[PDB]
Design a protein around this ligand. Structure first.
Ligand SMILES: [Ca+2]
Ligand SMILES: [Ca+2]
Length: 320
């Protein structure tokens, strides 16, 4: 029984909509421009041209809250600079325990559906339950913001809306610190590392962190200040949070090489250097080992040697 955000009671509201034969519309975060934004996503912006609020039940004949589990592939960033949040959610899915906390199970578009969903966040120094109606920003029938690789899955889009709600609007989520999201999802201790001054046992730190199910994210801070959000020649994006999803050692040409796996919340655009999906290095590794690690697929997830990682990336964040 978490603390009810703004006093909105999920069960009561759902029950009331059901009895009144209507679907929920949230007075605290209504389907209007003010929930979208105030400037770049404000009512007078071309970025919001053609945006229409629609429920999944208005979009598809068989919408689903969760399809084939709530995993990181269900996190594909939309037209919003909230990679910090999205990278946190992706990592969150790697910890069943915390995942079930944030995303209450038992929600669907079938039995008991009334156009209302809820999520729990660590806010105001406590666990809070936040509700939202399922009206989502769309353009041409497709979700404008976060969406799942599964076109009929909506749990991540609804979770992102709930986070947008407590912050005031989707635009309020434009640009941020991955650690803030980690905290808002765990209430745990966050710590960051300057990769240019990486500890000698940082890889070891990463290993145990991943083992315990901690949340890890990394990013690249470039010189250019007046710009934000942009890729490079090495196909990496700056000021963009990536979820660190694994850390494994392999035998290359007869020796131990420390590798690290991460995922771009865009769900696409990957590193093309050593150890990339179709890189040459995978040929000089025993089939078994490379069969269990390498995956050829444009999914935004890829491996890098730990050596290249600490050179290319500048910041690493870990939640407890
Ligand atoms: Ca899924
Ligand atoms: Ca990949």
């Amino acid at each position: 029984n978490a603390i009810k955000y703004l006093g909105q009671d999920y069960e009561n509201l759902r029950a009331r909509c059901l009895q009144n034969g209507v679907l929920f519309q949230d007075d605290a975060f209504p389907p209007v421009s003010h929930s979208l934004g105030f400037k770049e996503l404000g009512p007078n912006s071309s970025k919001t041209y053609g945006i229409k609020w629609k429920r999944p039940t208005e979009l598809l004949s068989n919408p689903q809250f969760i399809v084939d589990g709530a995993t990181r592939t269900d996190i594909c960033q939309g037209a919003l600079g909230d990679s910090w949040l999205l990278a946190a959610i992706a990592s969150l899915t790697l910890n069943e325990t915390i995942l079930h906390r944030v995303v209450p199970y038992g929600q669907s578009f079938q039995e008991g559906y009334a156009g209302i969903f809820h999520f729990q966040l660590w806010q105001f120094g406590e666990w809070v339950d936040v509700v939202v109606d399922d009206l989502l920003p769309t353009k041409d029938g497709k979700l404008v913001f976060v969406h799942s690789a599964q076109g009929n899955e909506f749990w991540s889009a609804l979770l992102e809306k709930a986070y947008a709600k407590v912050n005031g609007s989707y635009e309020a989520l434009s640009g941020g610190c991955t650690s803030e999201a980690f905290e808002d999802f765990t209430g745990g201790v966050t710590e960051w590392y300057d990769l240019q001054k990486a500890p000698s046992d940082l890889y070891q730190i990463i290993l145990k962190a991943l083992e315990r199910g901690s949340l890890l994210g990394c990013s690249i801070n470039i010189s250019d200040i007046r710009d934000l959000e942009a890729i490079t020649f090495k196909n990496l994006v700056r000021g963009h949070a990536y979820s660190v999803t694994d850390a494994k050692q392999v035998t290359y040409q007869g020796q131990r090489v420390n590798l690290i796996r991460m995922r771009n919340p865009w769900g696409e655009v990957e590193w093309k250097g050593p150890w990339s999906d179709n890189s040459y290095e995978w040929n000089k590794v025993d089939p078994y080992e490379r069969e269990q690690l390498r995956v050829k697929m444009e999914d935004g997830e890829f491996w890098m040697s730990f050596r290249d990682f600490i050179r290319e990336f500048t910041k690493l964040e870990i939640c407890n």
